[model samples]
Target: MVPISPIETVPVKLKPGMDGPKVKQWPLTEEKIKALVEICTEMEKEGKISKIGPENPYNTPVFAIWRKLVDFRELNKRTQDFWGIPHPAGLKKNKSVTVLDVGDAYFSVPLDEDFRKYTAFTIPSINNETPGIRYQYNVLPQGWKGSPAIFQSSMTKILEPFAAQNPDIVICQYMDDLYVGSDLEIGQHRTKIEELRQHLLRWGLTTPKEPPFLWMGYELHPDKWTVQPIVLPEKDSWTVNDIQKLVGKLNWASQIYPGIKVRQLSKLLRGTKALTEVIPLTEEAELELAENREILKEPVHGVYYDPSKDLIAEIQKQGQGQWTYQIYQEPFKNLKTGKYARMRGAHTNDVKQLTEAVQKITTESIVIWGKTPKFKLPIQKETWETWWTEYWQATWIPEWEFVNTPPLVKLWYQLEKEPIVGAETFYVDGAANRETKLGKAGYVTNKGRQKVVPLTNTTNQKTELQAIYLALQDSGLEVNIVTDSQYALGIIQAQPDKSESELVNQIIEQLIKKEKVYLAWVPAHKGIGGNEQVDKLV
Candidate 1:
């Protein structure tokens, strides 16, 4: 039989730039351990508790050494949103950033007597000569269901007073980790960093380094870091140990380099039980891992790309011993529904890379004006490739060809070509009177062109559709049309059964022919200048 020994402590892993919790261990005195054992022995004698064998009653929770259960992932986000603190992914060169790593974080805090019962356990007998013993923790140890929550809250409170002192510094806490962001000058920056370090020290917190430090992660590096698929080595069978190790590393990386594909790999770890048991890998998971490896090889300068959420390519710069930063998110909308949606944005340095990113988008989707729209030409993948390729090579592409894309996309491309300063706004109105037997469709542009269509025995909906068609036909440039009818807007967007298919189809066709068109609805009698002008003509 194997000899039993006290469990060895495994400290939390902190990379080179990460300053974890302080280096102080919790005061779990020997006297306390003895008293816990004595209490368990007495309880067994009194029939209140028993040996920690499977057949025995009065079982207690045992601690397991592993990662914390608390999710502090959103802590940084909340602080950034509430206090305008910069995100760690947005870190730049020369910017004043101070991270106070809390060494020996959870173990540093004492656990009260009331909470000790939950950490109760049985210590194995020595040589089978004496009855088996039991004990509980007096300090917060790993694997207690409630220990993580208590420690996390306690740490936050410990730093709360210091954070209040430096309101402008934007102090953020993640368990034992404290990140301070400030936009002060070099001299002031160093001063604030030192001030924060001293504050944490006074509160019994310790850091691996002095003031003005950096917290690095797997996906983050000073120069550059690789963010990709975390794959396991080939093996005949997958054990629980394999699953845990692979899953844990991938989970950590997802925080910095979040993506749908990486998240998919994480789902594989769910519902796992025994560490030695073999776990099965799915076909989709294997494909995703391979795909991630291919994509991770192509690193962006200073941005994290995640296709799961909205497409955003934030540019972070580190230069002149400092960094400059910017973010460019591509706007998108659902093509069939016309509802606003988010599509993944690409962070590319040139036309070739940009074209590759665009190819990932489906034919049924659209991407609109970004800060750097190298080619704001078309929504279709092939059309965009041609426009970007030809335009970069100084080849002329016809403007009419872009009518297949959205109006906003077409408008931005037009603005790029001509650098127009303002928009041409138009107003559309329709009136039908059954008593008078008169129907009219009229629109007036800001350019002072007024045109009206008169009809007999026609509904107001038909008049509204015709009014939009006429505006699109008459306008040479992108025009914004404000109407009072929601029905007109819905019908033009091809909302089924709202109007006759033939008439609605004509409006859709007209929309596709324009360089760009903007449809908006306003209260009919709001006394608006453009809408009132069209109403009087109708």
Candidate 2:
């Protein structure tokens, strides 16, 4: 049921007597989110009530008829699960596996102060006739946007250093689920697990249960020749939650059983909404089950595990410095049938592998480009020229929509009336700030004819005026002054204050003497070559 107020906007204050490494304050980062979770969970064990003050009823409820506002849109695209299984990438396979489950992991993440308010809740009092005292989450509550990604990234970082201590140990974490793999037996890996437990505990994070011998979705059979699929029986018609639970297991199973195609099911499972009915067991479901059983019965020698082919390994190797691997989905059409199922790069249709590929790229790069065949930082010629000129770099200003603003409409309309014959087309741009100021005017016809000059610490209007002045002095044929700045255009013939009127006077002087001069205002960064050149130069 909806509360009186849907959500609280008030910030939650810090709790008293709360000791330990605090969750780093907002603008959530991977490091801070992880730290916060560890600290809060430790505090909870110490019987620490939320430091956040009393909540309001208007705030979001702890549990409600409303579904948690989670977005699993990219869930189907992740491939992180592949990292846990041994692949054909030439890496040695671990003889035994240990799975560490971080219980109540989400509750461990300290909710940022800004978000604590949103988690406020009010319970029913007496016979549900009156609202009870309010309470809010001090930690990052479950069902919020980005909760999973934040938790998984933080957990990975916490475990990474310890894993690095021993090159033989390989750790793969997906949110609260963690797996530690080693080439040695489970008994031998005990020290590593104990070391991991101690490290987690030191950080105020804990794995309540000891690490299990099982790895991936397969139960470890010490004497058995092959690893068997640990398939949990699920209903034919279930809600979306059921699918999420099953998808990961199916993803892991697909790695061991080559013919077991579960990616299609994974995609379908995601299509259903949480709490909504979904029929996952189709006609092909029985075939997959039979295949899974047959594959499990096959000898272990037939299945080869290689690490080099794994996307996670490549990401770790190449994700440093200027080198980075990017994953793109390319479609191949069957010539006879003329149909295509999406394939993301060389990796198979596995979410865990793709997830790791995307994650590594994200962790490594400050910038990411989408749908492009290759990745590179774009450099405008003018940007290179002015690289040393301006200390600060600016983003491209969005092109104005004609229907939204009257000035933009008039600007484009006026741009259309220009005659192209012998037109000395030029774009002028300038920057003026507290630190420094500069003006630049460049011609589309001749890049060499560009003018760049330092300006007195003055308003942008004067710098823009200086750019026009330089352009007018350099012009030979009928000149067209194309600019994105409206201030420069408005003062052309109008009377204004002395500060602005001075620039207006210069323009009039040039117009009267010059053979032909026209002022045109065009939208900036909207594919006009001259406009972009001037922007980058400025």
Candidate 3:
């Protein structure tokens, strides 16, 4: 039972070199602080924030605790300077960032009990009659109006010196609680935590090693804290590889016990199921259930029969977070019959209905038109290839084009990178533009979202090339270069075949021939990986 940290609290820092906050402008003024403290103290003496308000107080303790933090922000800079704590990368620094929480923010302070009883597990019912009250499970909301700003301000005070001392470490502190890690090195992480612990003690923040630290966890370090994995009980049927990967870097105690290797078990089940089938049924579901059929192997179950009537509405609701979908492709069958179809974009749960709905729409339209829709119709032999290409392109390319627009660029950027898939940052656009402060290069890295080495040297081709060369020098992994420009690719590909062009030939000499560099040509402005951002950058 991993514990939950109390709605983690922290303070905000005054901007660099700013004097103490003005009383008139402070969100947490002397009067407000005095009033809140008096009210909260009385409530705590009576029980808690949960005890004061009508209708069970709506987990008002969270809000009560939040008020104290907001006041801490209004404290003078000499007092608040040590409070600024670093947050996880996604959240903005120094600013009050409200994490509009969807789920419970409460659990046993340290997971010392079963997860089902954890406070965070129980979300507040929205239908409550209490006025101006909100509950997060049995706990108050972490993102209540003044909470994040207050917490950030408090944290900035708690963490100022540590952050100042350890610039290399990632320190996320809410009040006295701290989580340290790094995108670069974990050793620096350990040192940062040690430094923070000392600072907290010096600042008179009582950071106890036991009991109060109710929610904290770490992998390979049970003696230090509690660890909780991201709870995904709904996806319990996922494979062992998936389970292991999820729990790998997380605190180990939170791991799914009896964590069966679903991957291995799934493979076995698939084999047995395949052997059980004799003939395929005419109905989509019967055929889907048939083990002998490869056609329905990867599809969500029941999708063939359950048509989604409200798919468009659902997609609109999901908006930017949703993924696009394409028709269930049957290369062998479709090639012979020329019929093609697919459901529109939708949530995973709606896949079955979506497929069914698409099929129904196609079948109905075909009855009225005398022939199936163009995409679903058998094409003449002469136009078969062209028609198929166009159909698939129309279904896929449109969304791709739309998302490339500014409204969706950030979303597209996020979708292209995954935590598990290792990507590289490789730069190769134009050597001519390399003379600008942006540098004359592209980058390659296995981690797509990894930091861009930010060293911009205009016109320093050798320096740019050398930066990559040095990074990969001892990587011991096979590296391949992707280039859209023939000149760039040719420099690597035509390595053995010497070039007369000075720069092209020079680049060829350094990378291809001398360094054993491998090059592959990728299309530009296309949605192909690596090339998309390169095109934008150029």
Candidate 4:
């Protein structure tokens, strides 16, 4: 009734090869031999293959599996053919991606009249008992080397006009598969891809593989879009108690649609006071309500939003370039259950937007990533988290350091507040005689429980960081650390380049374990009470 890929015909040019020994497939059973005959029978009836005389010049092996038309490892190897298939990595990425697969893909394209003979295949006579029949392809055979390129070229032309018309939906053609990608929302992507599917089907090409897209359709406006809801029960008129009731429905609509209801929708809320007062729908409200109602009747179906995967937003025409928002999730082992879990992170510009994003977290930890208007001061719990370490940094790392080891901004942040999770603060000090190269280092907790590292041949800086390290070993799961040497603190966070630097690394390693370790730097030897107690041991 209709034609598929009728406009294009590609010729295969083959190079001569020496008459080598015929390559044979493994032995076939009676059932498989009969199956191949039935396959040939059906293919001949479907116009996919036709019977030819046994005395053909070229008749290669036809492997069975739903039976391949031809299988010549040597023939394809020697043929001078052209072919192409798109690499997925080469396809442009998007907010959403969907794919379609053509049914009986290779057979959909008709073979050229002259080139059909080269594709003719002969079924081996079973048990070498009788002669085999030679059959030629009415359509392109899968065995040909150049078939993919010819199909690719045909698919390109078929998709070109449609793709050019809708520039946003990027269609990637890989032989029989069409990877339709788009950055638009689910509704937008659905409409575009549906059109493409229909176009392919109308050309007598079939896509019978993919599951149907279950889309909540929406209407695209010039500057905005409207969601087609799965509307509630129909009624003659709707009753509303207050403007807040209307606001609640509007709230639900915002997620389904893509508009901020600040200016345009606010018109309906004017001249209204508090709730408990019955609200009246304005003329504009009626029009808006009518449009939404009209969209609900005819439901559009396609792909849905999958929550398992993450998403990001991008803008293309800003300052001669494009910018992208970053979103990533990390997998960590939940030690309590011995199961791995994911922690999702999203970047936002401000604290309010950050709060909204936080609510979407399913892991139950509302980790915020945005400008901080304010923070709940010093509320540490099971997780050993600082404002900057895990939540603040744009990039995530397993073990890392701060740019300014002690940021002045955070220095003042911890100035007045004690560690909220009730960790003891220990003041550590170390002293070394330059001539003797003998060092003494120790730490005293706020409650005056003291422990000291043994005297050793070490420098002042090494001993200082060593005091912090030794303090960590004796202490339990919870503790905060304080030291007076800037050089000691610097080495603790620096790379292992110096002799003391390696000890500095060991000190930091101890700090990272267990719950909370708030390492702080203070000015040396004032009338500081905790410092004086630890100095005696040093």
Candidate 5:
């Protein structure tokens, strides 16, 4: 639905240039972003800041912008927190809806301005090299080079202060585009917009005069369109059971659509027989057929218009006996079967098998590349000794003497009243080790704590590897795996510059063919969360 009233616009200030000064690309690094989040969280708890209140400490446009940054960062982090699960990425736990308002902001600077300043000194020829004289066809592009960086930095800076004040709100800007949400509602549409208005009013930035929230496709001004999802196509109005397996994949393609649509129209462009064969067994078809069956079974509850009855019913009432009907047909015998049946006149045809002899022998090919041809040779005689040595290192077989150290401590702390943060790994004698390998990576639950068991047969070193495999197989999460074993990591990180000398590569190749599993490595026993856990369990 569209909004009735007009949206306020903000006067956006642009740096002087068509293209702004170009700067090196910068992604808000994990550390800086974390620091800003912590600051905002502290501010919120200490009552030093608030987005909305009669007397909020941070009530400025810059502060509002900062609050947005923090808000968006939190949302982003939350999304990152649950990457392995099937849930939407970085979604807030409690909310389902999200709203974003990219209100009007200023754009400054033009390209021609930069040419007059920087390139005026250069000339193509030595003869024409009059100091500060130019024969260039086009003026230098100003503010263009660093336009993205400048805009991103400006937006980030404007919002950073507010981010320092409000931990829950997320105001994110990717260049000029803005997105806000908590991932707690169906769409976060309502909360996002309300918070945005409050933030802007507090700060003094002009809300858009028209639709404050304009986008790549639409002007979200009151007169234009309302606060509804963008629906591009006419036919995107999907029914519930469009595509049975992958729902909502096509939803964003057409904001007006809620479900997927089976691409049946293209298939219908074939022969007439294809059209004659209706979409039987489909959800809609089955539902319609069921309704028809119900009507047939309960004929008393149904009524039909009968043109013949209108003409013949009067005759029946008059006792003329003209309403009665009789039927008769000549019977024919099946010549082949000597039976009075038309259907049995033809012989049944035998179906032939389509499988070839060689095809039956194998379902797929198994080839060890020339670098490591395990098929040709069961094991390389020369590398067997070395592989065994490396295998022990990769496994839990320690080469050094065991140390008797103090018992390791385990601690779990609460974060945002959810996800009790616990020590992921333990270090004893300055060596990192995991306390458990199998359980569903322990986390503090309301009932003290919860431990999830890993899929393993015998929780030993070899079994640990198997558990890793199983966890990864079941996880279905995209990960750039890092392991200690060069052999294991080498399986995937096939360095074109380096010679292939590992079995891991072969394993990687086979696994990737069916499912995606990226692998890499870190120093063994050096201690990483998942890796250290694997080692400790080993």
Candidate 6:
């Protein structure tokens, strides 16, 4: 629920030429709809958002984490970013940390009324009482790129006086999550924490119960932090229950892997029918299950997570303890069958194996094309050897719809929070005709809407590439171009500089003009809506 706060109310600023964003929604399953409706209903009660007439010119999607909003790339693109988060490394936790949980934290951060309508969102009707309605946030939205900055600003403002007053105590925070610590040891700062609460409550921001030692997705202990444990499959057991468990853990592991771009299974479990029934693994499923094993077998590289960080030293620069090994096996727990699950606390052998894996890992640098650079990989030489051929590192960006859509979000997967941002999306296509003995290149940004121009006497390949060339000429600075031809895309990316086709070189030139560009391949004539308009363009 949106809690009340007396913090600064943030204003909205729009970048030029970013006014048109299509009002958007994702028609979700009944289960999802019900889940959304319940939180939205609570939001309505808290006055975090309010129903509005069609006069509202904005709407964006909520984020995967419930009660979180996604400032669609359009909205965030227009937003003038004016802030930064506190560095996690500089957190004042030398002694103890009292993490204060703020309820509906983002909602408690005030939002200026002028742009309240700018934060609007809608839910399709769930029942008679819940008519499909649109509502704009009365406070900062967690999904907005600037929301964290705004919230962080507010927390720092309210706590600055306390920081000076209690200079002996270390008060640190990111967004609304505040942790009070001291320069000494074990829980001596209770009084300082209460005093800190008094200061916050005076400003109408309430600090609730502490924690189960969790914050920012890590289990925080006095000396260390652990990821939420993932229970892999058990010894020699095969049940639908195991299938779901394995799927869940693998999805989680893959999300955290940086070098795992080449693989994503569409549906590994095809015919499993019951949750409790014994099931045999599909060859496809077995392959994917092995993927997670290979994944945890070594730290993967190049995309979302960088294990190139301090590794085990990140938790305890002090020294090793039982707690350090507790979470070391989280991503590596083997998927043996026949038991309910093999999830257990670490043993001496497991710790020994962990040590062996750590020591066996050696960083190997193979110089390649990243503007002539080398990346230190904390993986075994064997794993790095294989990743060279299998991985492509575009990293992640805001407008990659696959990252935002269902199934991926259905799993508890998330990408890095850096919003590289985008400007527009267009689908382009080309067709050649023997009658004309030439070709036509076209693009579609709207249904029944396209701009087609006849091309030079050309082959089908050249024509398709020319479509991209045409689309790029009129596209936005941060462009996403969708095409049905991989051959066209291959030249645009892999061989653009050296292709015999000058048009491919020309298109690559167009690609460089954008602040960022994203290209995707969607299957043609398979009932894809945008492709429908694009195909009929010629």
**Among all candidates shown, the one with the greatest TM-score:** 6
**What are the candidates' C-alpha RMSDs?**
17.8, 22.0, 27.8, 19.9, 32.3, 22.3
lDDT of each: 0.48, 0.46, 0.32, 0.53, 0.28, 0.53
How would you encode candidate 6's per-residue C-alpha lDDT over 453-516 as one tens digit per residue?
7776776676787777877798767666788987876554332222334675577567656566
Judge candidate 3 against the unseen true structure and give its global Cα lDDT, from 0 to 1.
0.32
- Per-prediction TM-score to the true structure, in the order listed: 0.36, 0.34, 0.22, 0.37, 0.21, 0.38
Model 3 compared with the native: what TM-score?
0.22
Q: Candidate 4, residues 208-266: lDDT per residue as tens digits? A: 42322222244322222234454443334433333444445544443333221322234
Quote the positional error of residue 423 for candidate 4 in Å: 56
Per-residue lDDT over 1-538 for candidate 2, one digit per residue giving the tens place of the 0 to 100 score:
3222111122333234432121211133334434544554554565332534433322442221212232222221221221123322112346766677877677555555654554444333444354343445666556555467656656766767787787888886655777677877777788878888878766556684332234433343332212354564556566666666665555445433333445445656544545767565666656655565676565342222332332121111111011222222212210000011223332121112223443444433212222112212222334323332331333221111111211110100112235456677777776566455444333433444566676565766677776777677778747777777777766552322122255555655555456667677887668866654444345
Of candidates 3 and 1, the better by lDDT: 1
In candidate 1, what are the lDDT values of residues 1-538, reduced to their tens digit?
Answer: 4332222222322234433121111223344445545655664564433343333332243221222121222222221121022333333332465656777565555555433343445543434455445444445554433446666676766667777877767776665577666767868977877877766566555665433233333344433333344454567786767756765654444333323144344556667666687667688767766665654455333333223344332211111111111222334211011111112221111222223333322221223221121223234446455555544344332221232322212111211233233657678888787686678887887889888888887777777877877777777666778788887765443222112346665655565565666677788777877885345245
Candidate 2: stretches off by over 4 Å:
1-58, 62-91, 128-130, 184-188, 208-302, 306-538
* Model 1 residue 520 CA deviation in Å: 26
Q: What's each prediction's clash count?
A: 13, 22, 63, 4, 72, 8
Angstrom error at residue 478, model 2:
68
User: What's model 3's lDDT at 479?
Assistant: 43
User: What pairs collide in candidate 6?
Assistant: 234-336, 235-337, 235-338, 236-337, 236-338, 237-337, 237-338, 259-301
Better of 5 and 6 by lDDT: 6
* Model 3 ranges with Cα > 4 A deviation: 1-145, 157-161, 173-176, 182-194, 201-204, 209-538
The lowest-lDDT stretch of 10 consecutive residues in candidate 2 is 405-414
| Alpha-carbon lDDT of model 2 | 0.46
